Amino acid sequence: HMVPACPPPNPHQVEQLQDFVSQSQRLFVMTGAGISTESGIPDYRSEGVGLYSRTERRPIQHSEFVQSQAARRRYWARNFVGWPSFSSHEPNSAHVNLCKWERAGRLHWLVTQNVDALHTKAGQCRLSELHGCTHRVICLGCQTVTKRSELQERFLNLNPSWNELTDEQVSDFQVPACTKCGGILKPQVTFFGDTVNRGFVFSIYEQMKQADAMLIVGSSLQVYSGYRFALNAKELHLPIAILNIGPTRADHLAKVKVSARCGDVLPHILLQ
Ligand SMILES: CC(=S)O[C@@H]1[C@H](O)[C@@H](COP(=O)(O)OP(=O)(O)OC[C@H]2O[C@@H](n3cnc4c(N)ncnc43)[C@H](O)[C@@H]2O)O[C@@H]1O
Numbered sequence: 390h391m392v393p394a395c396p397p398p399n400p401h402q403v404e405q406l407q408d409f410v411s412q413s414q415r416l417f418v419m420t421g422a423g424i425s426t427e428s429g430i431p432d433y434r435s436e437g438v439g440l441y442s443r444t445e446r447r448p449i450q451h452s453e454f455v456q457s458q459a460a461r462r463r464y465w466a467r468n469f470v471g472w473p474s475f476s477s478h479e480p481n482s483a484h485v486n487l488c489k490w491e492r493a494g495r496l497h498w499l500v501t502q503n504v505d506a507l508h509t510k511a512g513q514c515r516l517s518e519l520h521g522c523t524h525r526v527i528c529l530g531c532q533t534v535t536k537r538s539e540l541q542e543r544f545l546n547l548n549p550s551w552n553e554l555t556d557e558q559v560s561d562f563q564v565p566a567c568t569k570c571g572g573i574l575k576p577q578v579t580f581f582g583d584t585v586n587r588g589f590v591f592s593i594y595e596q597m598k599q600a601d602a603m604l605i606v607g608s609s610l611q612v613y614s615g616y617r618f619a620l621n622a623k624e625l626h627l628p629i630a631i632l633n634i635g636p637t638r639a640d641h642l643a644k645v646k647v648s649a650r651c652g653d654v655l656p657h658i659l660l661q
Pocket residue numbers: 391392393420421422423424426427432433434435436439448502503504520578579580581606607608609610611612615632633634635636637649650651652
């Protein structure tokens with residue numbers, strides 16, 4: 390399964406993370422793909438187990454999606470097949486506990502790199518989805534945003550022989566067009582080489598200014614899109630803590646690092 394193996398969790402690290410969280414009133418939290426491996430969603434870079442470490446998965450480049458009809462067909466045919474299982478994943482105790490922390494007024498804001506909607510399903514309201522969400526679809530022509538669940542029905546009517554990975558296998562596969570303008574639809578996620586909207590970025594940094602600490606959960610921070618927010622914490626003179634099984638790009642900035650499954654540790658952190 391998808392959770393990398395980890396030595397047994399060290400109690401002293403756990404204690405230091407508690408003390409970190411106790412010192413905070415306005416925690417800024419960043420999560421990545423490690424917070425959803427316990428929900429059955431694989432991560433990308435866990436050594437020996439992530440999609441890029443262990444498999445032939447290559448992300449799609451944005452510019453190829455935008456410039457090639459055939460690339461769009463291959464993308465969408467795979468996304469169509471995977472949607473019923475992908476859409477059925479549930480939040481795990483880590484997402485649930487972060488939502489508790491928000492209810493208690495101790496989590497100031499959370500940013501995720503994940504596109505899986507799990508923080509939303511769990512009920513995290515003070516949330517930014519840094520890379521978007523696969524449950525939303527956007528037209529490249531008019532910017533209208535629709536629900537992915539609604540697109541599925543449309544895929545079924547257009548490709549009824551698929552209800553009975555190369556260009557040849559995808560020939561009988563047609564992609565629904567935008568119903569407002571006839572333009573190209575895309576999952577409202579940040580593909581490789583596309584960049585996050587600068588006003589959105591700027592609004593997340595604005596939430597940081599009032600935090601008093603940062604916690605990173607379940608990200609390698611290898612992608613600059615996420616690591617920049619740890620850099621920003623350091624510029625704000627915020628203490629940083631990490632709860633992550635493998636190494637991260639921010640390990641040198643952290644005051645406290647807990648190498649442990651996040652669903653084993655978070656339920657133990659108390660707010661009183
Ligand atoms: C634009 C897009 S969607 O980019 C995606 C993604 O948003 C982005 C950033 O990736 P990430 O940091 O979210 O994911 P990854 O680099 O795979 O790191 C996940 C980390 O989680 C750790 N981990 C694994 N399961 C656990 C666990 N249950 N408890 C605690 N630690 C865990 C792993 O050790 C690993 O260091 O890169 C991709 O191309």
